[PDB]
Amino acid sequence: KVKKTVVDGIAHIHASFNNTIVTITDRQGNALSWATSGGSGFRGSRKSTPFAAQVAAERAGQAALEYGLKNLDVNVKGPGPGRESAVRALNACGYKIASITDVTPIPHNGCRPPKKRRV
């Protein structure tokens, strides 16, 4: 029942080798709409494709169109596929993109990663 209005939001794309997660929020970091590849009906080896990321980005954008949101900045994070299909789907939704940034976290020395797989 309750509604709200907001413009000039921020879209976070979280790519990985298995799944991608799209989340539109306002500038303060409060989520409005979100969509994934597993929630778009792929569920497996098809979940890890740029097509699934495109579908997820369009679905999330159509969900977030309720608030208005005529401006979006973009934050990409992850090595997986769909690192760019989501970004090209977001403008196809009808948005205007102020900028794009990459916020992938890189340790400087950090903790040690797991063992190497013997396949």
Binding site: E84, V87, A98, T101, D102, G110, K115, K116
Partner: protein
């Protein structure tokens, strides 16, 4: 790895410029480097092999 869209250029120039900046920053290489633990023996072996190939290629140019 951060670009801006300035003075109404199409959203194909901006995306390719973003890709070029990401490639220049070596993001994906850094992410692939730290996926698993590479024991120091393997790291030294990789460095030695890279040096051998580099020197051989540089010598072959003349």
């Amino acid at each position: 790895p951060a670009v801006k869209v300035k003075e109404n250029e199409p959203f194909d120039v901006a995306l390719r410029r973003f890709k070029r900046s990401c490639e220049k920053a070596g993001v994906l290489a850094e992410v692939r480097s730290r996926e698993f633990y590479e024991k120091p023996t393997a790291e030294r072996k990789r460095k030695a092999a890279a040096a051998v190939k580099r020197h051989a290629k540089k010598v072959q140019r003349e």
